[PDB]
């Protein structure tokens, strides 16, 4: 049953998929962990804050605000 437990733990981790995963879930997952990776890495945030001419605190707050509904609301 070790394989079955692995199949239950892999499902538990947030961001994993399965044969019924849609395009929307996949894309919002990669957008969300992209925003978290931007918040983590110090020189990517530097790049963005120089590009759009904003303070780094403002870019961080904008990314956190975008975290809620990236890619718009779902289908139907």
């Amino acid at each position: 049953t070790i394989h079955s437990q692995l199949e239950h733990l892999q499902s538990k981790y947030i961001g994993t998929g399965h044969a019924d995963t849609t395009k929307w879930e996949w894309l919002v997952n990669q957008h969300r962990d992209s925003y978290c990776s931007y918040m983590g890495h110090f020189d990517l945030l530097n790049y963005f804050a120089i590009a759009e001419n904003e303070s780094k605190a403002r870019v961080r707050f904008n990314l956190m605000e975008k975290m809620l509904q990236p890619c718009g609301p779902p289908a139907d």
Partner: protein, 110 residues
């Protein structure tokens, strides 16, 4: 080429204000010696905040044909007991290792 009468290097520049170089090896003996120094310093002098050195330099792609000379120069700042434990595996004394580390730096950069 940075110094008069030196060798050509690849100078890079970073968004945090850092400056660094990548220099080629000219012989297999220097490459092997520095590879063994890096191997032994990866284990007996691990990064301070809990990171794996080989895993950090393989963040997005695995490392290929680069020796981290910023890990290697941390040999000069270890304690004498561990400096001896490291040096006696390379069949050498700490002053010889220090001189060999300084030679490649002064060959290219300051």
């Amino acid at each position: 080429t940075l110094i008069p009468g030196g060798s050509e290097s690849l100078v890079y520049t970073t968004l945090s204000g850092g400056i660094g170089i990548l220099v080629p090896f000219t012989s297999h003996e220097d490459h092997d010696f520095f590879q063994h120094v890096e191997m032994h310093l990866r284990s007996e002098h691990p990064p301070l905040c809990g990171r794996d050195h080989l895993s950090f330099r393989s963040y997005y792609f695995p490392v290929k044909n680069v020796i981290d000379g910023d890990l290697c120069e941390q040999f000069n700042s270890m304690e004498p007991n561990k400096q001896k434990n490291v040096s006696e595996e390379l069949d050498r004394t700490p002053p010889e290792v220090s001189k060999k580390l300084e030679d490649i730096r002064t060959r290219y950069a300051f």
